[PDB]
Design a protein around this ligand. Structure first.
Ligand SMILES: *[C@@H]1O[C@H](CO)[C@@H](O[C@@H]2O[C@H](CO)[C@@H](O[C@H]3O[C@H](CO)[C@@H](O)[C@H](O)[C@@H]3O)[C@H](O)[C@H]2NC(C)=O)[C@H](O)[C@H]1NC(C)=O
Ligand SMILES: *[C@@H]1O[C@H](CO)[C@@H](O[C@@H]2O[C@H](CO)[C@@H](O[C@H]3O[C@H](CO)[C@@H](O)[C@H](O)[C@@H]3O)[C@H](O)[C@H]2NC(C)=O)[C@H](O)[C@H]1NC(C)=O
Ligand SMILES: *[C@@H]1O[C@H](CO)[C@@H](O[C@@H]2O[C@H](CO)[C@@H](O)[C@H](O)[C@H]2NC(C)=O)[C@H](O)[C@H]1NC(C)=O
Ligand SMILES: *[C@@H]1O[C@H](CO)[C@@H](O)[C@H](O)[C@H]1NC(C)=O
Ligand SMILES: *[C@@H]1O[C@H](CO)[C@@H](O)[C@H](O)[C@H]1NC(C)=O
Ligand SMILES: *[C@@H]1O[C@H](CO)[C@@H](O)[C@H](O)[C@H]1NC(C)=O
Ligand SMILES: *[C@@H]1O[C@H](CO)[C@@H](O)[C@H](O)[C@H]1NC(C)=O
Ligand SMILES: [Fe+3]
Lengths: 651, 320, 323
């Protein structure tokens, strides 16, 4: 039905909930959502009740959100609590490692330093740092307290037994578990650093701003990043240990009332939320503090559906908790686009003799997600997907070079050219005269095929309905019920699919679309010469010649295919190999090693070699300021469920 | 870590196949052991024809060790001609059953491993491993296959090694113990700490079922490999049986193969055959021992070939 | 794409075949018990004839009773040959039994793996029409009680013993699992969303993040044949082991006699049966020669009175020669 069974861990929580139901009944109609309450002994009994279809929802902190996603519970984040304004909601906190400016040590040099922790068993002060530094700790790593004591040369971990672990109280004798201990909590951990007792403070991004009001005073502090570098305290979003969700509503992955909980909680925040009713308060109660939801909350936000607990919690948080729970301590997995790429990848796996391994996914964004969580390590991407992948935390390590060079490996290229290809016969066509005509795109989200012509179109029509602008066409990845899937050649299910199962996917595929169905194709400058003049042995291409095709110039002009240099839509960034930040060196090493040893499957078939990157090891740096700005302009018209999810963590 | 899908070690796979071909050899084993009894019986028929010739000479040793009653001697001789074949039927009835029951166990184990061996894909993902990014092939799985992995490459009951496995002097109890948890070792069963994508060994969501944990416990073999209703990630193998899987986490490899469903009947029915075989053999022994003390030395030193020529002579004489 | 399952009727017919193969052990035993009855009867008749010879009651030969001298010589030597032929027959009886056992074990493991692969939210690998999971109530040819290793049928279980008693022949039972006899209606079942991975060879099916491309997965010995990229939709076509394609339908056996595991069963059961019939014919012919020259007096004599009067006579004729 339309009732949501809410879980309460205490008697005072169960009564606030009866009040929640009663007040909801008094404002929502019969057809709409309703509340009902269930009482359980602890948070774990609540996670269990949901999994056992007894209850439906409960709000949890990140640590329990991890336990809830684990089997046999298999729960997931559905709704999130936000703090502060609606414009800038503060859904997550950043766990940071604060140090003093000029102390000259990195993350890998923490052994033998003096540490300041909020408290033993605390999230930002203990579980996250000690989780990440787990393998840097001396053996035996059990008891964990003993190992931490022998790693650092003196610590302050309040709430720890100083009788057993005296090195853990060296900076705050007794490890007092109250605010009476000057070095207790976030403020105290910062004070431990400020007073020069410790060298590093494991706190939140906010802690420095909560303890130092002057910008000049804060300037004398830096943060330790996982890449073994330092950054200013105001650069926490670029330099942190983990990104942690504050308070999350959870429900079953399958058979969980995800939409019914959202509807109920969206209606609830509108009627009894922050500054709404004097009658009932969702984030306050006389029976106690933080009952059902944190009193500090300003309301709720829907969790993007593509978002799974692992991605939601982030790689860093997950890795920290896995290390602590498991205690598990001591090649590149290449992601393949459908069975065609996988077949090639397999040959590469055996030939490289256990240097490169494979994983398959049907879409490029499914592969980016695999890289993100850890299922895969690296894959070669088109510029448009480097933007999405980069916004998801990944980094480029090698660039695809296409021009014939002496030392290809160390000679960077400005990029290829995005062109609008027409037939010489269709002389009526002009760059401006494309309204109501047939288009042929490589795929949606691609550089030459989508991002460049649709970006130049959006800057003119000032609207996102591209299916209205064109009569029909083929843009693999588009909604199967759109006019932009009507000219596709994929067999049943395979129609408008963003892989080689769809015959009009890619540079060659979009060219095939122009010849057989469409009247305009969006591809790279070298697509027409690579397929014409018999160069492509395929029946459709065998008898085609480049003399019969023209280019659409931005000034409503037409020029031959060879005259691409002065008749291109925009310069396109070369395809680059992306990876997880914490893999750069090994991917770079094995790929260079591999490159010297050994359709456009895995990489573009016109790749002469894989070239080194220097200062450009970020998506903004690689793609350039111009491309990023142009892709950013299309964010309003985005269809990517992955991009929507990645930007929920870092907009 | 949790998305971790371990593979079975080739060594563990071979040991299961090893037992499997021994079980296929139980048919030949019963046949060989049954054949000995008939040899021991043939000797009894030859020695009783030796007695009948001594009865006819009236030159039956006058052994006071009860050769005086000619009547009961010959009565038991004729009785034997019938009493033995119906007890020999009893042992063959048990031989067929043990042979079949064993065959069932063999097939159960074979299907399991063979399916795991076929669930291999070019590189990185497979169910039987060798440590490399390449799945185990027929050269690694020498006890399972006689060449390229397929249905016709598995060993048949009349095949080469099945027959030589039947003369290995290994007793059932020993071969069974070989696949126990102790005899294999936790490490040598499953390739832990490696994601080889084998869904056949995951009861949790995205394993046997794509969205949910199983409603029940699961078993490969007949209780050899056992799983809880929601086994994910790093396989926590411990020694135990289908009944020993109390948690959702639990992975249990057999410690006492006699507790395993499929082996129970093999053990039982091979024991039946042996029990009978040995009771028939003692019956022949006690009979041979009682007849021999009555055979005359002239007929005793008589060779099998001329023994049958001479029998015919007095036989045809007395008839007329 | 649709996510279907193996229907309970297909599972039940495969199980049925498996219990018939387990029955073969009992079938060879019954058939061999028939032979030893006939062979004992032959040994009875030879004593009866020997008694008639000594009592001179062998009828005025209408048939060849005049040369009992040679027709007894041959009988005492034929009695010996049949005992060696019996053992050759029994040798085959144990091999037939074992081979059938193998075939039954292989099938049992297959169906049992599908039967256990069942969870909540209408997610399963064996269906009862367009729903499931199928429980022990459905799948009664497979199980005794709730699905488990201990509820599968065993060789001495009543079901296997009673199946051995039927007049059904191997070929009939083998055909009951063919694609023709079963049909697409009886093979594919379930809702379009039962999430059964055992029946999917495409990425995230049998293997996670890959497909079994090295081998064309076959359940049974080539009963249910998969390729490398099957949806899990349970799209079925008739075909044999080599017939499965990458993007094609699952190939269900058209002719079960062509399947690996049934190959030795057909062969070894036939070997037994041929050897059985041959021995039975031989015993018949020799008994038919004997029953002619016995006489009603000696013919009526059986068991303990036979031996008693045969020894009575042998002792008498021996005292006759002694004088
Ligand atoms: C993907 O899953 C699909 C169902 O979810 C499945 O669709 C099946 O496609 C076949 C195509 O051959 C259809 O069969 C048709 O083929 C015969 C050929 O003799 C025609 O005469 C008929 O029109 C017949 O319908 C199936 O009907 C269809 N299945 C269903 C249940 O609709 C795909 O095959 C799966 N893909 C792979 C690679 O397994
Ligand atoms: C029933 O099958 C029995 C085996 O399952 C078989 O027993 C074995 O008989 C063979 C001969 O048939 C003996 O082998 C001897 O002869 C071969 C001749 O080529 C030699 O190569 C061998 O070295 C050996 O000397 C086996 O020794 C014997 N096994 C035992 C343990 O006695 C029976 O003979 C079969 N019975 C019938 C009637 O078919
Ligand atoms: C041999 O196995 C058979 C069963 O297959 C046992 O029983 C004989 O066969 C059928 C079984 O239904 C009965 O009708 C017969 O009367 C049984 N006896 C004979 C002599 O045919 C058989 O008894 C088992 N062996 C022994 C010696 O017990
Ligand atoms: C069996 O298991 C693994 C398989 O990768 C490996 O360690 C080895 O082959 C076997 N065990 C040992 C310790 O030899
Ligand atoms: C095996 O799984 C079943 C089904 O969930 C469970 O009830 C049972 O307790 C487990 N086995 C044993 C003997 O504990
Ligand atoms: C199996 O198939 C038949 C025919 O489709 C039908 O009875 C049903 O769909 C399935 N279930 C049973 C009970 O046989
Ligand atoms: C079946 O397996 C063989 C293995 O060599 C091969 O022909 C192919 O991979 C599979 N499919 C077809 C179409 O035969
Ligand atoms: Fe491109």
């Amino acid at each position: 039905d339309k009732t949501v069974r809410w879980c309460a861990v205490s008697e005072h929580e169960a009564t606030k909930c009866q009040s929640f139901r009663d007040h909801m009944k008094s404002v929502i109609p019969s057809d709409g959502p309703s509340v009902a309450c269930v009482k359980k002994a602890s948070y774990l009994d609540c996670i269990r009740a949901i999994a056992a279809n007894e209850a439906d929802a409960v709000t949890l902190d990140a640590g329990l959100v991890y336990d809830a996603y684990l089997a046999p519970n298999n729960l997931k984040p559905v709704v999130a609590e936000f703090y502060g304004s609606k414009e800038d909601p503060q859904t997550f906190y950043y766990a940071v490692a604060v140090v003093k400016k000029d102390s000259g040590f990195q993350m890998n040099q923490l052994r033998g330093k003096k540490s300041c922790h909020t408290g033993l068993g605390r999230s930002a002060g203990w579980n996250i740092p000690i989780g990440l530094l787990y393998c840097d700790l001396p053996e035996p790593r059990k008891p964990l307290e003993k190992a931490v004591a022998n790693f650092f040369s003196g610590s302050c971990a309040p709430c720890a037994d100083g009788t057993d672990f005296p090195q853990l109280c060296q900076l705050c004798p007794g490890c007092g578990c109250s605010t009476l201990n000057q070095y207790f909590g976030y403020s105290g951990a910062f004070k431990c650093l400020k007073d020069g007792a410790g060298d590093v403070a494991f706190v939140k991004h906010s802690t420095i701003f909560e303890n130092l009001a002057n910008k000049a005073d804060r300037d004398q502090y830096e943060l330790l990043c996982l890449d073994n570098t330092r950054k200013p305290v105001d650069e926490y979003k670029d330099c942190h240990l983990a990104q942690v969700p504050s308070h999350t509503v959870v429900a079953r992955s399958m058979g969980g009332k995800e939409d019914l909980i959202w509807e109920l909680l969206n209606q609830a925040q509108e009627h009894f939320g922050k500054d709404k009713s004097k009658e009932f308060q969702l984030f306050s109660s006389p029976h106690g503090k933080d009952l059902l939801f944190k009193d500090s909350a300003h309301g709720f936000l829907k969790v993007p559906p593509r978002m799974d607990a692992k991605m939601y919690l982030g790689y860093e948080y997950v890795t920290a908790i896995r290390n602590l729970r498991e205690g598990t301590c001591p090649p590149v997995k290449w992601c393949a686009l459908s069975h065609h790429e996988r077949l090639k990848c397999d040959e590469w796996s055996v030939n490289s003799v256990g240097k490169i391994e494979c994983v398959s996914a049907e879409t490029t964004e499914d592969c980016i997600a695999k890289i993100m969580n850890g299922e895969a390590d690296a894959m070669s991407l088109d510029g448009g997907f480097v933007y999405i992948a980069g916004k998801c935390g990944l980094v480029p390590v090698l660039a695809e070079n296409y021009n014939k060079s002496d030392n290809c490996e160390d000679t960077p290229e400005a990029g290829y050219f995005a062109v609008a290809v027409v037939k010489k016969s269709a002389s009526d066509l002009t760059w401006d005269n494309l309204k109501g005509k047939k288009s042929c795109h490589t795929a949606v989200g691609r550089t030459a095929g989508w991002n460049i012509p649709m970006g130049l179109l959006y800057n003119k029509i000032n609207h996102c309905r591209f299916d209205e602008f064109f009569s029909e066409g083929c843009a693999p990845g588009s909604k199967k019920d759109s006019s932009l899937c009507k000219l596709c050649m994929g067999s049943g299910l395979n129609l408008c699919e963003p892989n080689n199962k769809e015959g009009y996917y890619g540079y060659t595929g979009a060219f095939r679309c122009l010849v057989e169905k469409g009247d305009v194709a969006f591809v790279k400058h070298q697509t027409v010469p690579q397929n014409t003049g018999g160069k492509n042995p395929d029946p459709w291409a065998k008898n085609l010649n480049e003399k019969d095709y023209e280019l659409l110039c931005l000034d409503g002009t037409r020029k031959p295919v060879e005259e691409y240099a002065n008749c291109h839509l925009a310069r396109a960034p070369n395809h680059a190999v992306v990876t997880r930040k914490d893999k750069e060196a090994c991917v770079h090493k094995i790929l260079r090693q591999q490159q010297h040893l050994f359709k456009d499957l895995l990489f573009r078939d016109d790749t002469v070699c894989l070239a080194k990157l220097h200062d450009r090891n970020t998506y903004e740096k690689y793609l350039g300021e111009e491309y990023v700005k142009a892709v950013g302009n299309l964010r309003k018209c985005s269809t990517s469920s992955l991009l929507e999810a990645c930007t929920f963590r870092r907009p | 870590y949790e998305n971790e899908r371990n593979a079975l070690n080739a060594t563990a796979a071979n040991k299961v196949c090893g037992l499997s071909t021994y079980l296929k050899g139980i048919a030949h084993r019963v046949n060989s052991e049954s054949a000995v009894v008939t040899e021991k019986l043939s000797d009894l028929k030859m020695r009783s024809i030796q007695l009948q010739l001594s009865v006819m000479r009236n030159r039956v040793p006058s052994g006071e060790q009860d050769c005086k009653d000619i009547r009961t001697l010959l009565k038991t001789v004729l009785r034997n001609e019938f009493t033995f074949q119906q007890e020999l039927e009893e042992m063959r009835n048990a031989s067929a059953l043990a042979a079949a029951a064993a065959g069932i166990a063999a097939g159960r184990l074979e299907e399991w491993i063979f399916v795991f061996a076929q669930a291999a894909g070019g590189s990185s993902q497979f169910c039987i491993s060798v440590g490399t990014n390449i799945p185990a092939e027929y050269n690694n799985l020498q006890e399972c296959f006689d060449g390229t992995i397929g249905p016709e490459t598995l060993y048949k009951i009349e095949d080469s090694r099945v027959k030589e496995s039947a003369q290995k002097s290994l007793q059932l109890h020993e071969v069974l113990s070989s696949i126990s948890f102790s005899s294999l070792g936790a490490e040598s069963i499953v390739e832990k700490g490696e994601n080889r994508g084998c869904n056949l060994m995951r009861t949790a969501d995205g394993g046997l079922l794509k969205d949910v944990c199983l409603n029940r416990n699961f078993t490969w073999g007949g209780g050899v490999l056992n799983f809880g209703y929601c086994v994910a990630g790093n396989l926590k193998i411990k020694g135990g049986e289908y009944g020993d899987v109390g948690s959702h986490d639990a992975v249990r490899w057999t410690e006492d193969p006699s507790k395993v469903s499929i082996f129970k009947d093999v053990i039982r029915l091979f024991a039946r055959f042996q029990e009978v075989k040995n009771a028939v053999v003692k019956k022949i022994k006690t009979t041979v021992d009682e007849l021999t003390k009555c055979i005359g030395q002239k007929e005793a030193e008589l060779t099998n070939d001329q023994l049958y020529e001479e029998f015919e002579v007095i036989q045809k004489y007395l008839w007329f």
